């Protein structure tokens with residue numbers, strides 16, 4: 001099919017996404033930047049979608065977190081999420097797609113702004129939300145590895161799939177884990193979708209970037225970086241550690257598996273055959289910036305190797321003394 005301006009798309013229905021793309025790129029993402037609203041929109045895809053259980057209910061990727069915001073945003077596990085919900089609401093009202101579609105579309109468009117990013121498949125036509133998600137379906141950073149894997153598995157994800165989705169933490173920061181240090185990133189490159197998250201979580205924890213003993217927080221290897229207890233434990237767990245390590249300096253695998261697993265997540269509670277493939281609307285992301293490296297001042301001996309079958313790859317360190325990671329704007 002051909003849109004009004006001559007551009008090809010696989011299905012004529014997708015043409016309506018282009019004005020939405022332009023609007024959100026200019027007015028939500030600060031001119032197609034990989035900034036705070038991109039990170040929060042990506043986070044929102046998960047907090048909407050994971051509200052899905054065969055036993056316990058929930059409509060999955062259905063826009064419920066917007067359509068029933070006063071209910072869902074008050075769940076403890078959704079702390080901090082109301083900013084992005086409130087920011088996206090006007091766009092949904094202004095345009096002609098469902099809240100469920102918009103959440104996934106904004107997430108995909110956002111990721112495409114980030115150097116190293118990947119194009120996530122996007123499908124159009126999610127019905128409006130029918131009911132609020134049940135509470136207690138979103139994993140928390142203080143939940144045990146087994147609890148997290150159980151919940152993600154309940155929603156449909158194998159343990160290796162959870163590792164692949166956690167590539168998102170490569171472009172991520174925390175405001176509520178340690179409120180004394182808002183906007184503290186999970187890796188040294190929160191503006192680049194890269195393997196640094198998987199490297200740096202493997203390093204032995206040395207310190208606290210803010211205060212000690214926050215719930216859901218582990219020791220970080222670097223000033224200016226925060227480590228979730230969940231990520232700490234997943235990098236070291238037999239079920240996930242070898243997959244975790246395999247992401248290190250493997251940009252193609254990170255991209256391939258993130259795109260496929262995000263697509264799966266985006267379709268929780270949905271039937272792909274009842275939707276329209278509009279993947280070709282997502283822009284080409286910028287190329288990777290930077291190479292895979294240990295932080296300056298670190299060596300292989302600082303890695304806590306957790307994959308028995310395969311040794312950690314022989315990365316080199318950035319030159320110079322240990323340095324701190326800048327907070328994110």
Ligand code: HEM
Nearest residue numbers: 039040042043046139140141165168172173174175176177
């Ligand atoms: C598997 C269990 C997971 C846990 C326990 C977890 C936990 C967290 C926590 C505690 C934060 C910081 C929130 C704050 O204090 O501000 C965070 C941020 C974030 N999460 Fe995860 N998460 C998980 C999986 C995921 C998944 C599957 C995605 C997929 C998109 C995701 C995307 C993000 C992003 C993009 C941020 C950064 C938000 C920002 O910088 O504004 N997370 N996560």
Ligand SMILES: [Ca+2]
Nearest residue numbers: 048051060064
């Ligand atoms: Ca939902």
Ligand SMILES: [Ca+2]
Nearest residue numbers: 170189192194
């Ligand atoms: Ca990164």
